[PDB]
Amino acid sequence: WFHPNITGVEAENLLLTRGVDGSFLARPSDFTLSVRAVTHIKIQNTGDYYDLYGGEKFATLAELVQYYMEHIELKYPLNCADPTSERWFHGHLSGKEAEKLLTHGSFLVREPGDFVLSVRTGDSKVTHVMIRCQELKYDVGGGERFDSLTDLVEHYKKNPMVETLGTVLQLKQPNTTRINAAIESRVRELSQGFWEEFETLQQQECKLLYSRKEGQRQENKNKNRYKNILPSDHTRVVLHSDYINANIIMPKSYIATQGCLQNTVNDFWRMVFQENSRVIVMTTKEVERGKSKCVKYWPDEYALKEYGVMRVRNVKESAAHDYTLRELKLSKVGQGNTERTVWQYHFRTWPDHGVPSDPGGVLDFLEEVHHKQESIMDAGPVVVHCSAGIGRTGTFIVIDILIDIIREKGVDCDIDVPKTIQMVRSQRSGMVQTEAQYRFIYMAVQHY
Numbered sequence: 001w002f003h004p005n006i007t008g009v010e011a012e013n014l015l016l017t018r019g020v021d022g023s024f025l026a027r028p029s030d031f032t033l034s035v036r037a038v039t040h041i042k043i044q045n046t047g048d049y050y051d052l053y054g055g056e057k058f059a060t061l062a063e064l065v066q067y068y069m070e071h072i073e074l075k076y077p078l079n080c081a082d083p084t085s086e087r088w089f090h091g092h093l094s095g096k097e098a099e100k101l102l103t104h105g106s107f108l109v110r111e112p113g114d115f116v117l118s119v120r121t122g123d124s125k126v127t128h129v130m131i132r133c134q135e136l137k138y139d140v141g142g143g144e145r146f147d148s149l150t151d152l153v154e155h156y157k158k159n160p161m162v163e164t165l166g167t168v169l170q171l172k173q174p175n176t177t178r179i180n181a182a183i184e185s186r187v188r189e190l191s192q193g194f195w196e197e198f199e200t201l202q203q204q205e206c207k208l209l210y211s212r213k214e215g216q217r218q219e220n221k222n223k224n225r226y227k228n229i230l231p232s233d234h235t236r237v238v239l240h241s242d243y244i245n246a247n248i249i250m251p252k253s254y255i256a257t258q259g260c261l262q263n264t265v266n267d268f269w270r271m272v273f274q275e276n277s278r279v280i281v282m283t284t285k286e287v288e289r290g291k292s293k294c295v296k297y298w299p300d301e302y303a304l305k306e307y308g309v310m311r312v313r314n315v316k317e318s319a320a321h322d323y324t325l326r327e328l329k330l331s332k333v334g335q336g337n338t339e340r341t342v343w344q345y346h347f348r349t350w351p352d353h354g355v356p357s358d359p360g361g362v363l364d365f366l367e368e369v370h371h372k373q374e375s376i377m378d379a380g381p382v383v384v385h386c387s388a389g390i391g392r393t394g395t396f397i398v399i400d401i402l403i404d405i406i407r408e409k410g411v412d413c414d415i416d417v418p419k420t421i422q423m424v425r426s427q428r429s430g431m432v433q434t435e436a437q438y439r440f441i442y443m444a445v446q447h448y
């Protein structure tokens with residue numbers, strides 16, 4: 001249902017000719033939901049979530065579409081044929097280059113008007129299968145003809161081609177992003193190249209296996225800052241009544257969470273204590289563009305506040321250019337020996353929309369956070385929150401994970417930004433929201 005390189009007119013004709021009523025598609029415009037008369041519904045994503053006009057806020061475009069197909073009718077997704085966003089698709093490439101690149105089950109489809117399925121087999125050889133394209137459909141020389149190269153690949157992923165002498169041409173996996181640290185050259189090549197690689201990652205949203213059940217419960221709706229933006233049930237924080245919109249991220253561990261609500265302040269301190277977290281990363285202001293993003297869950301400097309069964313002291317506040325650092329002290333009301341310092345690094349210079357022009361400041365912040373975390377024996381996950389706990393939270397954890405690798409291996413390590421994002425998304429959907437953030441992660445790793 002997502003079409004990466006179409007226009008409003010192309011979409012309008014597609015839905016009128018190849019579609020019916022209830023038929024819909026999505027496309028980059030910022031996104032547009034084109035439904036069939038043909039209506040165009042705007043989707044904006046400045047970095048926190050997908051905000052549909054006259055609709056709701058979502059972690060992914062696929063979560064958005066799944067919700068409106070279940071609850072202007074979204075009934076029939078009008079499928080896209082362009083293979084540009086598929087991992088296996090290389091477009092322009094020769095046989096030799098594909099042979100050398102592939103040098104088991106590893107495949108690709110390359111490019112008169114015809115395509116070539118190059119597959120590796122071993123314990124080795126590279127088999128090239130021609131794909132004829134006649135009157136818009138695709139085929140391997142006989143049998144079934146496919147509406148798109150996608151239908152072809154998925155048909156042969158399930159049903160592999162058998163070579164004359166019994167060789168199974170398995171379609172297992174498509175890696176063109178695992179660059180060695182060195183980054184400078186890759187950033188130049190992706191400079192767009194970044195948007196192309198970003199939407200390939202977006203096309204991998206629905207491959208992820210996750211449930212959102214506990215967050216959809218009656219007793220837990222009030223505990224969600226955005227009703228549709230929910231934690232993954234397999235990695236959610238269970239409080240030992242048990243609910244918080246938070247997930248554990250394990251590549252140093254992190255807890256990705258939303259900005260505190262007035263009714264979730266006590267549950268946030270119950271989580272920090274239980275998890276033995278000593279570092280909080282706040283990547284948002286309490287209020288941005290007149291809307292509240294997170295409530296003040298920490299006392300004023302020198303003050304002491306009781307938050308349910310938890311007691312928090314604000315020892316000292318230390319201002320830096322980009323951030324404030326609050327030395328907090330947490331204990332359970334009743335038992336004195338339960339006390340520990342909790343350090344809250346509150347980044348305040350993040351723009352209301354988009355990303356910082358330079359990642360220097362973010363990189364100084366994360367460096368400080370990392371050394372404060374490494375200075376504490378038996379320390380729990382680093383708590384990271386923004387507004388929804390997916391956009392900024394995701395950009396901060398991904399940059400932190402990748403620089404963690406470059407700290408322990410040096411300028412000689414193999415990094416894969418989209419592979420890291422997909423892995424984090426497997427633990428909380430929507431982690432890293434926009435293409436601008438995606439590019440900022442590359443620029444951050446570059447500047448580091």
Ligand SMILES: O=c1c(Cc2ccccc2)c(O)nc2sc3cc(Cl)ccc3n12
Nearest residue numbers: 175177197200201204418419422423426
């Ligand atoms: O998806 C994966 C998986 C599989 C995977 C599944 C769950 C959690 C982590 C990893 C994998 O090993 N490697 C890569 S590289 C790559 C590039 C892009 Cl643009 C998009 C995806 C993608 N991708």
